[PDB]
Amino acid sequence: NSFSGYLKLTDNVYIKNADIVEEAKKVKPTVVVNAANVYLKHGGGVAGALNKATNNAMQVESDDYIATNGPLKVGGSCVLSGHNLAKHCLHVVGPNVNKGEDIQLLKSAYENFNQHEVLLAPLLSAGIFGADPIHSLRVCVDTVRTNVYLAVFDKNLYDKLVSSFLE
Numbered sequence: 001n002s003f004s005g006y007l008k009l010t011d012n013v014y015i016k017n018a019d020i021v022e023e024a025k026k027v028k029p030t031v032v033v034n035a036a037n038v039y040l041k042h043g044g045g046v047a048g049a050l051n052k053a054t055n056n057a058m059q060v061e062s063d064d065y066i067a068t069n070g071p072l073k074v075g076g077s078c079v080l081s082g083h084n085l086a087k088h089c090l091h092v093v094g095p096n097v098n099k100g101e102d103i104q105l106l107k108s109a110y111e112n113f114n115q116h117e118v119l120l121a122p123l124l125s126a127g128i129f130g131a132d133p134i135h136s137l138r139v140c141v142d143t144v145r146t147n148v149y150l151a152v153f154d155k156n157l158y159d160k161l162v163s164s165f166l167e
Ligand SMILES: CC(C)[C@H](Nc1ncnc2[nH]c(C(=O)N[C@H]3CCN(C)C3)cc12)c1ccc2c(c1)S(=O)(=O)CCC2
Pocket: 018, 019, 020, 021, 022, 035, 044, 045, 046, 047, 049, 122, 123, 124, 125, 126, 127, 128, 129, 151, 152, 153, 154, 157
């Protein structure tokens, strides 16, 4: 958990303009959060980047979890191996508002972070999941009580998020 170069927003929420994959390799955190879908199909975006960094071992392990346990629910999670990225991967399903899922489930999604003392995470439901990223940060700050280090791989969005929080 050797996080560096983060800006502390609240006593438990830190933020950096960084690629979560590169952060995971440098930091070696106890937990890395994946922005998953309910069938754990890591086809693109953040989930595809983390799977590629494990040389597809994450996808094979995820298919075996799904065969035995069935899909997750939107707002839910599961803990699987972190492989070379972390001790554990917390797969969390935030709502995909571009597909009509309820934005209120973003609170349930962040609530899953509270079962882990320290986590490296992306901004849930942002990007192609369609949520307003400034609203996602507000829900994170209001809901997560354990220590969360957010990696946001876009300087333009990082600057808008920091400006919005410090208003
Ligand atoms: C909003 C954007 C900036 C954000 N994207 C990111 N944030 C953090 N770390 C990121 N890594 C990457 C990435 O592609 N790394 C590669 C690039 C080469 N490298 C060796 C690995 C993107 C990343 C973001 C956050 C959440 C969500 C999305 C996108 S999504 O569209 O995948 C839908 C799910 C939710």
